[PDB]
Design a binder for this molecule. Structure first.
Ligand code: CL
Ligand code: NA
Ligand code: NA
Ligand code: NA
Ligand code: NA
Ligand code: NA
Lengths: 56, 57, 58, 58, 60, 56
């Protein structure tokens, strides 16, 4: 049941999305399948399936 | 092992960024484990979550 | 509510299925399982995997 | 998830498998598991993963 | 526990196969192990762990 | 339950991602769905769904 992604809550990370976009993202919440982020003044729900990797 | 944030989007205006590069300016009309129902203008869509990259809300 | 899904509510309806490959199916839905949607497209019978669908207009 | 798949109805049948890579397999189905479809394409035996299939015409 | 139509990939263990990957790469491989989600192979001198989700089909 | 990827913990491997990228990666942790790696001085969380294969 363990996941490392939960430990990224509160960090500001780079999310490398599957299409080539990169989000500079403050992580505000993590669920089994989603990562909630703030990107500047935007709030996003990011699906983990759309992420390739995260630099932190 | 069950909680999801997407359920809280029900009833809200959102921007859905799809894996194909399309962007939907939508109102959410329902959310299930694997689907998000939306209105886009006059159109009614069932959107599979697997086809979504992210949602601005 | 285990296994609630909106897709099976499209059973018996005329829909437009937008596939991940860019194709759009003008379809009549004849069955919906957990992972598949059965459709008629003109004279053709198709088994469509839900994972290959982006969205459905109805 | 109940024990039902429409893909099982295609066992032993001639079908066209439309793959996510754009290929279309003219296939005879020789087995169906939860995640795979076993086929004969000409003289070739293939194990096809369902996740790689967009739809099947039958 | 005896479910014939559960997983065919496990029967590939120890066999020569051609693996067609989702990006168009093709592996001329020998299977050295199979798990629920992975296939272990030798390709030439190289040892690879291949995720099944990255495989389109396998010729055997 | 069993997975081979867990046995790569502590190894330096080449991770071939679905976008065509290769990571020269030291594996520092493995969960059901993630592989934690060091790539040079960068720390990454890599999702297994984004990996095609790993050379080890
Ligand atoms: Cl790909
Ligand atoms: Na969700
Ligand atoms: Na059908
Ligand atoms: Na899969
Ligand atoms: Na790929
Ligand atoms: Na790491």
């Amino acid at each position: 049941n363990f996941e490392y992604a939960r430990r990224l809550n509160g960090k500001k990370v780079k999310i490398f999305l599957r299409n080539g976009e990169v989000l500079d993202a403050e992580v505000t919440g993590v669920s089994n399948y989603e990562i909630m982020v703030k990107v500047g003044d935007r709030n996003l729900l990011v699906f983990k399936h759309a992420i390739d990797y995260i630099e932190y």
